Amino acid sequence: MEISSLSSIDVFKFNSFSKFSNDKIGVIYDEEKLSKFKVIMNSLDTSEGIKKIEVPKDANIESFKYSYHIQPNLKYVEDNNVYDGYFLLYILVGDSEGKSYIIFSGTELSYVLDKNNTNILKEIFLNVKKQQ
Amino acid sequence: GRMEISSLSSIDVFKFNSFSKFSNDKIGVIYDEEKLSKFKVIMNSLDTSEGIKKIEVPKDANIESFKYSYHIQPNLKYVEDNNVYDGYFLLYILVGDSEGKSYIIFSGTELSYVLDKNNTNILKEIFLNVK
């Protein structure tokens, strides 16, 4: 299963570490931001700058530049066929050490990302706005 | 991104013998997943990364300036309109000049890209010891 494309990322207020948020902030549609997030998502288990870790249970949102619950809406390839899918993620971008975290909602699967990846995440999540 | 490369099966490598005609002088083939996956990422990021820039085709590039110069045929699968298709590209590639830059030119077109030092380092890994 490989992500071929993202169509959007729905962005929600980070209001829980256990339940995916229904407090919607906005949506990311920009092709370049989506392409950069795809690359990160496809490199979680194969990059020197990303590491699988236990869920940081004592993390809090005030320690990070950006904290959101996000739903990347995507297409993936499996068995030479294309499928529509999504993920429900908690994302914590840019702590005091320049690290970031991605947690898969409803699981204990999580990753820590290095400064290089954090810089990319800061580009992706800059000025998330509601059309209002 | 209406067309997204999902995977590469190989890259055929040919001698860089022209700036106008794709070479049929075969040197070898790259099969390594680590290498192919890195090349895939570059090809999908040509228009969407800070380290790659669309440029006019270089008018006075010399193969002697580069660590590697090849004509390459990446063999691939891509997604378009919810289908997986077989495809390929015919590229001229110039890897690692004295400024650490690399170039990709699409054979038979005016489409070309310059790649930064980070990408050049990746290309050097991909094109090390072609057999």
Side-chain angles (χ1 to χ4, degrees), chain A residues 1-128 130-132, chain B residues 1-49 51-130:
Chain A
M1 299 186 359
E2 198 74 0
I3 302 164
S4 50
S5 62
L6 274 59
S7 54
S8 61
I9 305 164
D10 294 301
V11 182
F12 303 84
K13 187 169 179 58
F14 199 127
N15 63 3
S16 179
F17 275 93
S18 65
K19 294 306 314 193
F20 192 86
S21 175
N22 301 135
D23 185 355
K24 193 160 180 172
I25 288 168
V27 52
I28 299 168
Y29 293 126
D30 183 75
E31 189 63 15
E32 174 153 357
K33 295 177 175 172
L34 296 174
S35 168
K36 290 167 180 180
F37 197 68
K38 183 186 110 173
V39 167
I40 290 167
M41 295 299 298
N42 282 334
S43 72
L44 300 172
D45 295 316
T46 58
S47 167
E48 287 268 25
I50 304 171
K51 192 190 170 53
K52 191 186 286 177
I53 54 153
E54 75 201 27
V55 179
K57 294 188 189 316
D58 299 313
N60 57 60
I61 67 173
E62 299 83 5
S63 305
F64 294 87
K65 179 73 202 188
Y66 305 111
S67 315
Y68 294 122
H69 286 196
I70 63 172
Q71 180 186 318
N73 297 301
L74 57 82
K75 296 180 180 274
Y76 67 96
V77 171
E78 179 185 333
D79 299 304
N80 298 297
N81 301 324
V82 183
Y83 299 100
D84 299 306
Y86 62 91
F87 292 119
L88 300 177
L89 311 173
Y90 319 144
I91 194 156
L92 299 169
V93 181
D95 69 10
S96 67
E97 302 197 320
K99 297 303 175 64
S100 300
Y101 299 84
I102 294 168
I103 301 165
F104 284 74
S105 179
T107 82
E108 297 186 83
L109 178 59
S110 74
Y111 295 84
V112 60
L113 302 89
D114 73 353
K115 291 179 182 173
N116 286 348
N117 282 298
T118 292
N119 294 344
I120 296 163
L121 291 167
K122 290 166 62 175
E123 293 165 4
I124 295 159
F125 293 100
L126 177 62
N127 298 323
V128 176
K130 195 188 231 32
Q131 172 52 69
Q132 59 173 338
Chain B
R2 290 190 160 75
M3 295 171 73
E4 294 280 351
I5 300 162
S6 49
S7 63
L8 276 60
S9 53
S10 63
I11 303 165
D12 295 304
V13 182
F14 303 86
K15 186 173 165 150
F16 201 125
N17 63 6
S18 180
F19 277 94
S20 64
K21 182 159 83 85
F22 192 82
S23 175
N24 77 329
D25 185 0
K26 196 159 181 172
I27 286 169
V29 194
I30 301 168
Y31 300 131
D32 291 343
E33 175 56 19
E34 297 90 341
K35 297 179 172 72
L36 293 174
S37 67
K38 289 167 179 101
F39 197 72
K40 182 183 110 174
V41 168
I42 291 167
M43 294 299 297
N44 284 334
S45 316
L46 298 172
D47 297 319
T48 56
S49 47
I52 304 170
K53 287 290 132 182
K54 191 185 287 177
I55 54 156
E56 285 177 12
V57 178
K59 297 189 189 316
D60 60 6
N62 181 337
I63 64 172
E64 295 167 2
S65 303
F66 293 88
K67 182 160 193 88
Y68 306 112
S69 315
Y70 294 122
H71 286 197
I72 63 173
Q73 180 186 317
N75 298 300
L76 55 81
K77 296 181 188 179
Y78 66 101
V79 176
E80 177 185 334
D81 296 304
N82 300 304
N83 295 323
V84 180
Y85 294 120
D86 297 315
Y88 66 96
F89 293 115
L90 300 178
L91 310 173
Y92 318 143
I93 194 155
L94 299 170
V95 181
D97 69 9
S98 67
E99 303 196 320
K101 294 185 174 65
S102 300
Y103 299 82
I104 294 169
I105 301 165
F106 286 75
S107 180
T109 78
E110 297 178 338
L111 183 58
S112 175
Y113 295 86
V114 61
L115 301 90
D116 73 351
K117 290 182 182 173
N118 176 56
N119 282 301
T120 292
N121 293 345
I122 294 164
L123 292 166
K124 290 166 62 174
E125 181 190 350
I126 296 160
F127 294 99
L128 178 62
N129 299 323
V130 176

